[model samples]
Target: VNSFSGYLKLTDNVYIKNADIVEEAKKVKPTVVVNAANVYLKHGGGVAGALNKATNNAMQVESDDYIATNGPLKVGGSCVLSGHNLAKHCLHVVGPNVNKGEDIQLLKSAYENFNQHEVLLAPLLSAGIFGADPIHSLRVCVDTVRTNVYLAVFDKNLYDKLVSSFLEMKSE
Candidate 1:
């Protein structure tokens, strides 16, 4: 995002930074499934830096019944995931892109085959890679989500700005 902390309002209800997102998450139905990736991880820079792969190792806070990220998407020569297992459930997926034939099947299966059948509220997440353009990443995410699915596609700047505002508050 243009700044740090999770303050930019994606919606009146959803905030996209570490603390704010976490607070919102806590309010989520325990049965509400979260489709997330690196964004859920905490980072020192608030929200922008929060999604950085490097910060994941240090400031982790998992808030979903399930955590879904394509495994093997390495960054900065390191590829370890960190999060809180405190949540009741977790799901980590491995993939190239869900748009591809086999990958698409697997991605769909992963979501549908969860141990618990419940309403899912997915966050914008990534298939992830060390060297991929933003547009391609966006494409992968869009294709993976099912058509007619109740998806949330808010402005990315909302999250970016929220981080900035969140950091300002933290600085004090």
Candidate 2:
């Protein structure tokens, strides 16, 4: 229940709400849960691993089969797969590493696809292990869509950062 501390309620009725990603991803059962996955779409690490393990590796095997058939995603690419009992579908997306790719643009582009879903749950893309700063990532998210998106964050530090950044952006 470590969520909903603050939120950005937009004009279109799209409220970007803070959420406790781990429990919410499995429990909220939003129709689409975004997995902060690598380019390969493997479910071995980070949120990807967390969700994969939750489904008892069924999602992993499905991801493996997906890559085997389709090949790994390019940075900023995305794909969808069965939730395997977790949700309706897992929207697996790859975000750019700040050190390598066009961090801001690619992060935004990666998120563009996420907004396509009517009921979506998301993590802050590329903010953690990928090295994209949470401030920019949050802005990209805030700017990219006009729909309700539940942002599930696992790390408290970044969660705090998002809360600070959200308020800071308001001064403009």
Candidate 3:
């Protein structure tokens, strides 16, 4: 990151920051930004809505077009789309809805499926409306995601939890 934010550098290429995801996505333009997408890939709210609004509804249109052609995306499945302004590409991931099944392996696949990027500017996938437990979610994210990760968060509580959790997990 060119400018400092409340962040924890877990490794040479991975950092978790207390910052707006959209803003961070801009700072790291050309990065593959991850969206915790619905099974249908609708950019309705949360990270999806914000990204959609920022891109002037570009993502939503592509998302709808994708579904119309490809059908509903399965849990753990992902697809890339041309990014508009803040990203080089957008990787939409269908995270597990833990209310049905946490499906740890499936969730792992959501992060695992993309191998083409060096830096991935992702939110804590599945940790929002998908109802993934933040602590366990981050644990899986830390273990499974393969590329350089910039995990951006806007809340202090989540920032603290993720920072502490990363430290605790890394110490071992």
- Residue 149 alpha-carbon offset, candidate 2, angstroms: 0.7
Best of the candidates, lDDT: 3
lDDT of 3 by residue, 39-109 (tens): 89778778999989999988888888988999998899889887778788888888888877768568888
Best by TM-score: 3
Candidate 2: stretches off by over 4 Å: 1-19, 101-103
Q: Is candidate 2 or candidate 3 better by lDDT?
A: 3
Indicate the residue-level lDDT of 66 in model 2. 93
Q: Give the C-alpha miss distance for residue 115 in model 2, angstroms.
A: 2.5
Query: After aligning candidate 3 to the native by TM-score, how far in Å is the CA of 118 from where it should be?
Result: 1.4
The lDDT of model 1 is: 0.32
TM-score of each: 0.32, 0.86, 0.89
In model 2, how large is the Cα lDDT of residue 149?
76
lDDT values for all models = 0.32, 0.75, 0.79
lDDT of 2 by residue, 21-104 (tens): 657855676678788888777666678888888888998899889999999998888998997777788889888877665555
Model 3 misplaced stretches (Cα beyond 4 Å): 1-7
lDDT of 2: 0.75
Q: Give the clashing pairs for model 2.
A: none
